């Protein structure tokens, strides 16, 4: 089992959690900026939903900006696998590309998906 302080906070209660890949590490996004994505970066998103019986359902999305570097998109994919394992494999994984996101992912943000130019410098 592989862990990380952000792994300890993930999927404990229903809601939405977003992290950004920042030089080979996973860093939480400030809550008020949820829904604004830098076109130069990649992100990991965890949507947690409660069930009628009381159990939790997990949907993992990794979002890739049109200008994110190879290290960031590769790191987002590996972190997604590792977080799924920490959740005992119970999450469903989804790949999201800037501008072609699934209807479900866009529906998480009532104000709409928005993009910004720039981003955090690459780890390479």
């Amino acid at each position: 089992v592989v862990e990380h302080p952000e792994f300890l906070k993930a999927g404990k209660e229903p809601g939405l959690q977003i992290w950004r890949v920042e030089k080979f590490d996973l860093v939480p996004v400030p809550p008020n900026l949820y829904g604004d994505f830098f076109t130069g970066d990649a992100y990991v998103i965890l949507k947690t939903v409660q069930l009628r019986n009381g159990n939790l359902q997990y949907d993992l999305h990794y979002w890739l900006g049109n200008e994110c570097s190879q290290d960031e998109s590769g790191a987002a994919a590996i972190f997604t696998v590792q977080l799924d394992d920490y959740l005992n494999g119970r999450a469903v994984q989804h790949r999201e590309v800037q501008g072609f996101e699934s209807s479900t992912f866009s529906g998480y943000f009532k104000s709409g998906l928005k993009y910004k130019k720039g981003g955090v410098a690459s780890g390479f």
């Binding site: 592989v2 996973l26 190879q70 290290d71 790191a75 590996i78 972190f79 780890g123």
Partner: peptide, 16 residues
């Protein structure tokens, strides 16, 4: 090789 470079740079690799 590029994939190995990324994997072995992650904060979680110390535990792997």
């Amino acid at each position: 090789w590029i994939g190995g470079s990324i994997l072995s740079s992650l904060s979680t690799f110390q535990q792997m």
